[PDB]
Amino acid sequence: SHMHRVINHPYYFPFNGKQAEDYLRSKERGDFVIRQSSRGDDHLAITWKLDKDLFQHVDIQEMGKVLVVEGQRYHDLDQIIVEYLQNKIRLLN
Ligand code: NA
């Protein structure tokens, strides 16, 4: 699946939610990280910065096999990375 390969992705970090928020505090708006999630063995979480000191934690669920994020179905992790980078680009001002 995608679970055993995500640990080597450039945007994957061995952080829990709080550590992710601390990491993103000094980053630009829209920056994010992918991390493990207690929602289950086939889940991951995306933590991204909405604005100064404001973060969002988003569930990624795996279910061959696709990744679901907020109703949207993705076939590869990179597609998700592309989505959040695109979101980050649009927020440039
Ligand atoms: Na897990």
CA–CA dist 93, 73 (Å, integer): 29
Question: Residue 27, SS3?
Answer: coil
Handedness of CA 22, 12, 42, 66 (dihedral sign): positive
Q: How far is the CA of 36 from the centre of ligand 1 (A)?
A: 5
So what CATH class is 1-93?
Answer: alpha beta
1 touches 62 (CB < 8 A): yes
Q: How far is the CA of 91 from the centre of ligand 1 (A)?
A: 30
Q: How far is the CA of 93 from the centre of ligand 1 (A)?
A: 36
Say which DSSP state 12 is in.
B
CA–CA dist 43, 3 (Å, integer): 8
- The experimental technique used to determine this model is X-ray
* Resolution of this deposited model, Å: 1.9
Residues with CB under 5 A from ligand 1 (ion): 36
